Amino acid sequence: TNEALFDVASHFALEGTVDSIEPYGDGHINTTYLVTTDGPRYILQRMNTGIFPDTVNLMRNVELVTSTLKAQGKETLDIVRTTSGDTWAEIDGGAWRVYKFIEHTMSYNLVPNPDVFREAGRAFGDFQNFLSGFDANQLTETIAHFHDTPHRFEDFKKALAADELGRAAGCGPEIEFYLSHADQYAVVMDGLRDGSIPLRVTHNDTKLNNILMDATTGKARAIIDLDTIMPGSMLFDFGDSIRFGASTALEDERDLDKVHFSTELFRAYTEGFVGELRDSITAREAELLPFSGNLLTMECGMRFLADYLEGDVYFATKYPEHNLVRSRTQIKLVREMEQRADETRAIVADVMETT
Ligand SMILES: Nc1ncnc2c1ncn2[C@@H]1O[C@H](COP(=O)(O)OP(=O)(O)NP(=O)(O)O)[C@@H](O)[C@H]1O
Ligand SMILES: CC(=O)N[C@@H]1[C@@H](O)[C@H](O)[C@@H](CO)O[C@@H]1O
DSSP states (O other): OHHHHHHHHTTBOOSSOEEEEEEOSOOSSSEEEEEEESSOEEEEEEEOTTTOOOHHHHHHHHHHHHHHHHHTTOOOOOBOOBTTSOSOEEETTEEEEEEEOOOSEEOOSSOOSHHHHHHHHHHHHHHHHHHTTSOGGGSOOSSTTTTOHHHHHHHHHHHHHHOTTSOGGGOHHHHHHHHHTGGGTTHHHHHHHHTSSOOEEEOSOOOGGGEEEETTTOOEEEEOOOTTOEEEOHHHHHHHHHHHHSBSSOTTOSOGGGOOBOHHHHHHHHHHHHHHHTTTOOHHHHHHHHHHHHHHHHHHHHHHHHHHHTTSSSSOOSSTTHHHHHHHHHHHHHHHHHHTHHHHHHHHHHHHHHO
8 A cells, every 4th residue: 555655646746755655634535645755745635536426527626716715815725736737647546636735734623612613613704705706607516415405315215225234223213313303404405496595605514624723823724625615505514514513522422421512612603604704694594504503413414324324335434333423423413402492593693793
């Protein structure tokens, strides 16, 4: 594997002699490596072509978004071209790209304090304003039905019916949760379809670890993981951030007694996010901010459970029950979100008042 990785790196216009190439992060989707040279560092990624089969359109999107950010003077992912001059390469059956390593940054897999999450809100709120500069038609959907929760639920039911590994028998309570909540999945798609929720270009994977913060100041430096930028609703970006970051625990926390929905963290993110968007957010969008957290958490939880039932073909895992463990944290969070619905509505109202 090491020899193969060094060979891959040799296809790119790196500006130093490679000393090591090692797995970096715990991403579920692409395979990411840190390339350390005698000078600069790089991120080398093998794109998951099972999930992103249309590499040409994916890289066209990434090139467009990054070049636009650069034209505005913003720090972003800097593609390092192949020695042949291309934005990526097919090498020995894999699709590979390289970015410059963004130095002097911190990222977080869990909110350590409310200020970090407030800053995350500012960063993703600001990113909505950036993406509003694009026509929906400029950025291709890299994955269809991506936050179409009813479509995700159809996929879940298919996984359940197939029950390829006989795993359904051991996750009855979790299956029942997603079945019983089925009435709740259509709200955003219904509003997009009838024009009552604006169709906007969105990031679509707004977990906290997709923001790099400055290692000294804590100020957002750059939003990363640009692979799912495509038309959607602002509510997908807000709700997914709340899913991941308003939790008191890791997404794959095995001890459910550590998992809670924090209204303090909800408030911190809301203050940052709405602060960037207050005069643009529609009445209907504002009405749905609290529930968007429930919706995206249920969608992701359902996807984890579907993957568990399918033998973990979608998300990377470290052990057999990993996706079940992930699905369970999402369920616990939704149950707590339901209990705090009046509070979160009040928080949104207060932020709307003070901004
Ligand atoms: N340009 C960069 N500079 C520094 N770190 C980076 C850069 N690009 C990616 N990373 C790191 O790579 C890891 C995540 O890569 P990412 O492309 O977000 O993974 P993904 O698999 O496509 N999505 P997911 O698997 O669900 O996390 C994180 O640990 C980031 O800190
Ligand atoms: C391309 C893709 O499926 N990305 C997913 C994202 O949708 C999901 O919310 C997250 C859960 O941690 O894992 C990945 O980042």
